[PDB]
Design a binder for this molecule. Structure first.
Ligand code: HEC
Ligand code: HEC
Ligand SMILES: Nc1nc2c(c(=O)[nH]1)N[C@H]1C(S)=C(S)[C@@H](COP(=O)(O)O)O[C@H]1N2
Ligand SMILES: Nc1nc2c(c(=O)[nH]1)N[C@H]1C(S)=C(S)[C@@H](COP(=O)(O)O)O[C@H]1N2
Ligand SMILES: [Ca+2]
Ligand SMILES: [Ca+2]
Ligand SMILES: [Ca+2]
Ligand SMILES: [Ca+2]
Ligand SMILES: [Ca+2]
Ligand SMILES: [Ca+2]
Ligand SMILES: [Co+2]
Ligand SMILES: [Co+2]
Lengths: 204, 389, 389, 203
């Protein structure tokens, strides 16, 4: 060891390490109910995420989309998609509200998490979330993920000897970005940042 | 012929003075190069502080990205964090949890790497078709810099990783935190806490004064403004590795922990922002190739939509997990072309077509689109983003 | 034991937003890094348009110089030359004299090199003693960039060099012209007409839109804003290779055509602008080494004025004719030190002392001072430029 | 060949190729005398280089210093140091006056060059310099230069195995830059650009 740094104090660790792991490591003592969460959500969150956590305008939807994961356009929310409740608590506590993060107490965060469960149809309106019962909650998509398997499912296929000559591929144009016309433009209508025409006069 | 007055008449710059050596202590590009800048596509996101901008890769050459136009991706904006206010904590399953100042960090043994930072979402808007016009937009969530910093192994050695410690969780000083979990094997390999990029301190928007550099791995893991390294016995499964940076598959399950960025390439010119205005004859095809799985070994170029391929040359070195420049010189007869490039890396992996990827993954992966890009070069020299089939 | 409020209290950057992704299309360093800039020493020249400024090499790391703080040397100032107005002429002992536009030049096959540009005069004020305080000043007439452009050999092939054409004369578009003569063997080896430096167009002050890159050779020959390549049967013996860039020797004769820059190094920290403020214990010694005669093979570091040497490590690659970063980590007990670095290149050449150079050349060479630099580190951590004997 | 570029026209070559080599290649027809050169110098040059080409203030000295090349501080001028007259003509024509270059005619440049010869004591005050007699002029230091010989005189010496341990070197401090105190400074007196003290408040 080089002898650099100094020992972190308990107060310092407590202030910065608020991560919660899926098995409940990192949970702190506290509780909150759905009704309290609703009130907190109204005051601090509904302005973006809706009174029922359903989203306003284009802000994130926090409830809904159950069973949509094989639809043409899935709706991925806490209830339809997230695997663990730990993530809800942790992310809310650390990073919301957007623009004024880290203003929620431990109890406030339990209450809000209870309300998000209720809004996703996962608990009744009298539910109380505590540090003791937190890990009893299992989200619908808990078993919906698996570690990267490209090494089994893609790399062998894509590491085959590729074709160089007279390759049997289709070359008919099927999609064109210009059909959408949703790229920023320069004043002349070209894609923004297009190279200047060196045959025309240089810009002032 | 008629003599050109730009030669036969003396021009002011060949008679009068230019600017003095004291005019610009820290300079910017000449004004004629104003198009070589970041671009922002408003519709892609809900807020400009949790959003993305795009490196002008259509206009660049070589491999080093000028840091002033190197893309940004933030989730709660680019924060101002002085070296005086900076603190780095190491805690968790360690023998002694530690707090470092920036001064302390400048005293550890240093290392270097040159590495691409590619956003997991680069090209993601192209998963379902051809949407944006220009490689700045469809491939420009990338930058490539020479980093200098300290290996995480040496910092962790100072704290003393306990036998139970299996994962490192890194989080930033910003409101968003961007917490991500890393297996210890990667941490101890080549993850760096970088302080310098392309010679000088990190730019504010790139994590000043300290960021993680995670060679070959998706950009989200390159935690900026890094404040804490926690050692745990399991992955945290934070928002940025559950809700986000997970890759939905056709059966409704999703891959998680898709850390590596696979071999990829793009022709930067000709491209939609770089039309051929000079007529028939010699034409330089230029582009970039890279792989998170090692060194690029070759790049093949097609002029006919993948029916026939010619091996390009690599210009410069092919460093591991770094941008690599390729060129093919042709004699353009003015015919329409369908340009493609296809990277190969040292593992033998060959960059797939978009169709080959979708045949496995479907259309809702969001991330990790390394599919072959096609440019339709028209007889007027204009160039389009297309799909072909 | 007193918690630090920078950790225990939530700071604004961990709650509120930072800047948006649309705030800065082409960014600059954070304001805390304002000392990392070019400096100007007025007394060195009579006019600030025929003058020099200095790269902040004390503060940089790695090998790539940020182009915004990369030094400038002009003789009639930095001129503004658009790509539209640019013309390159090849004439003289050629089969067909040619005029090229910039559009034409973008159509030739491209090459790359990474190379240091060191002014012949770098350290020249130190020939007669220790004068300036800081390696920015005594070694900072240097920069190192990744260049892309076209080899002169391919341009010259278009014109067709006659067998009698033994020399190439290159001149700039500026009033000063900076005309210099090159033997054809060097031209045909690795001289490039460069258009890109560190990814983007050359900066105005670095020759936009085209300069010569002359690997390993004195910076004066890196003609900026290059307008004409003349092929002659003998050297022109222009002002910049007769009056200037000739090296006066003890007998009153002078060397001419001292093209190559010899192996050299400098410790960038500690250095006079980078005092040791952190007390005893771990200390990083960092510096740069380079040679015009090929790759650096090693750098030795002394803490005791050359009585004893320890081989440092090369951090990154040692590319030919390019800046190379070295490090040596020590445990500083607070004693005074006399720091030196000594480069060795692949030819076996070992960087000489100032005294060894002066024994052969005397004191009035002006140029080509590659002598070993000594830093006196005092007990208070302050650092001085000294000579020792 | 790629077929890029186009043929340069004679007017174009003439406009840009004004180089003069030591053997007189590049000289154009013309002439000028000392008296005409003096008048041109007065109007266009003397404001910096002096009425007698002796320099004003810190601007370059164009005449003087003969025999000084082994002095502690040599004075290197056209007369004392330059090897070839060609360089004088070419550089003046292409690059002076400073701030308004390429304003002299061929004849003006011959005249100024004649005047610079006179000012260096090398011709009489009635001398006429022409394209035909130009190469008869030999400058005092014509034989003062030799091609780089570091490969003979330095490289063999400096490529020997160096000392690593217990080296017999002198380590007494003999020169200190702080004695001169001629480096730009930050407001606290440190060398300009010194690293901020991270133990003090941020700017
Ligand atoms: C009040 C305390 C809350 C709570 C409980 C939540 N939000 Fe927000 N939120 C906003 C934006 C722009 C995002 C996206 C951020 C990004 O992608 O980087 C979010 C995200 C969330 C989530 C995650 C959703 C997901 O599916 O990943 C959650 C659980 C969440 N928020 C909870 C925007 C806003 C606001 C707009 C100004 C406000 C107010 C809030 N959020 C408040 C809250
Ligand atoms: C009127 C036509 C003249 C002529 C005949 C000369 N000068 Fe100047 N001069 C000036 C400066 C700053 C320099 C140095 C430039 C640099 O080093 O890049 C020069 C240089 C010269 C030389 C070369 C001297 C040498 O020994 O190398 C010569 C021959 C020369 N000049 C001739 C400055 C000025 C002016 C200041 C505004 C003016 C006016 C002139 N020069 C004008 C002329
Ligand atoms: N602290 C923090 N680190 C972060 C982010 C963030 O929002 N906060 N964004 C990440 C993402 S998604 C990407 S792609 C990269 C982008 O790095 P850049 O801004 O240097 O391009 O930073 C990563 N690191
Ligand atoms: N046309 C032209 N080229 C020039 C110069 C000049 O004055 N004019 N100065 C030269 C000198 S002396 C040096 S050291 C280098 C400096 O290159 P830089 O300005 O990119 O550092 O440019 C060289 N090329
Ligand atoms: Ca306490
Ligand atoms: Ca309210
Ligand atoms: Ca509160
Ligand atoms: Ca359009
Ligand atoms: Ca007048
Ligand atoms: Ca001082
Ligand atoms: Co992934
Ligand atoms: Co020289």
């Amino acid at each position: 060891k080089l002898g650099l740094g100094r020992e972190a104090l308990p107060e310092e660790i407590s202030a910065w390490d608020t991560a919660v792991l899926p098995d409940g490591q990192g949970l702190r003592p506290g509780s909150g109910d759905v009704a309290t969460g609703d009130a907190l959500f109204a005051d601090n969150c509904a302005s973006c995420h809706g009174d029922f956590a359903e989203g306003l305008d284009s802000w994130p939807v926090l409830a809904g989309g159950d069973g949509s994961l094989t639809d043409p356009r899935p709706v991925k929310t806490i209830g339809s998609y997230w695997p663990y409740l730990s993530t809800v608590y942790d992310y809310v506590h650390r990073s919301m509200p957007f623009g004024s993060a880290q203003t929620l107490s431990v109890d406030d965060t339990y209450a809000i998490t209870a309300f998000l469960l209720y809004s996703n149809g996962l608990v009744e309106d009298d539910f109380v979330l505590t540090h003791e019962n937190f890990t009893q909650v299992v989200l619908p998509n808990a078993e919906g993920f698996y570690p990267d398997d490209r090494d089994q499912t893609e790399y062998p296929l894509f590491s085959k000897e590729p074709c160089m000559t007279d390759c049997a591929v289709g070359v008919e144009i099927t999609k064109r970005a210009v059909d959408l016309n949703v790229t920023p433009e320069d004043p002349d209508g070209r894609p923004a940042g297009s190279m200047p025409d060196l045959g025309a006069a240089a810009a002032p | 012929g008629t003599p050109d007055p730009l030669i036969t008449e003396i021009q002011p710059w060949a008679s009068e003075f230019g600017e003095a050596v004291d005019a610009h202590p820290y300079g910017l590009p000449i004004h004629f190069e104003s198009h070589v800048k970041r671009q922002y596509v408003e519709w892609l996101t809900e807020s400009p502080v949790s959003s993305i901008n795009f490196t002008p890769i259509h206009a660049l050459e070589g491999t080093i990205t000028p840091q002033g136009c190197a893309f940004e991706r933030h989730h709660s904006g680019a924060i101002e964090l002085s070296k005086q206010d900076y603190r780095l904590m190491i805690n968790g399953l360690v023998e002694k949890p530690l707090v470092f100042t920036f001064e302390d960090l400048l005293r550890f043994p240093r290392t270097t790497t040159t590495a691409f930072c590619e956003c997991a979402a680069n090209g993601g808007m192209e998963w379902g078709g051809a949407q944006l016009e220009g490689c700045q937009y469809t491939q420009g969530m990338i930058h490539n810099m020479e980093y200098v910093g300290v290996p995480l192994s040496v910092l962790l050695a100072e704290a003393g990783v306990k036998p139970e410690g299996k994962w490192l969780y890194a989080e930033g000083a910003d409101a968003s935190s961007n917490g991500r979990s890393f297996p210890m094997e990667k941490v101890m390999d080549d993850v760096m806490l970088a302080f310098f990029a392309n010679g000088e301190a990190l730019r504010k928007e790139h994590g000043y004064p300290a960021r993680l550099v995670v060679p070959g791995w998706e950009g989200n893991m390159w935690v900026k403004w890094v404040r804490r390294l926690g050692i745990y016995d399991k992955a945290v499964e934070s928002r940025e590795e559950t809700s986000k940076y997970t890759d939905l598959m056709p059966d409704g399950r999703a891959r998680k922990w898709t850390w590596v960025m696979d071999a990829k390439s793009v022709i930067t010119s000709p491209s939609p922002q770089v039309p051929i205005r000079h007529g028939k004859g010699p034409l330089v095809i230029s582009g970039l190739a890279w792989s998170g799985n090692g060194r690029i070994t070759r790049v093949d170029v097609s002029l006919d939509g993948g029916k026939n391929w010619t091996t390009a040359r690599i210009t410069g070195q092919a460093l591991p997990k770094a941008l690599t420049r390729f060129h093919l010189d042709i004699d353009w007869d003015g015919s329409e072309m369908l340009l493609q490039s296809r990277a190969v890396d040292e593992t033998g992996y060959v960059q797939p077509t978009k169709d080959a990827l979708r045949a496995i993954r479907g259309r809702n992966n969001v991330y990790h689109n390394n599919g072959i890009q096609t440019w339709w070069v028209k007889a007027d020299g204009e160039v389009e983003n297309v799909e072909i089939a």
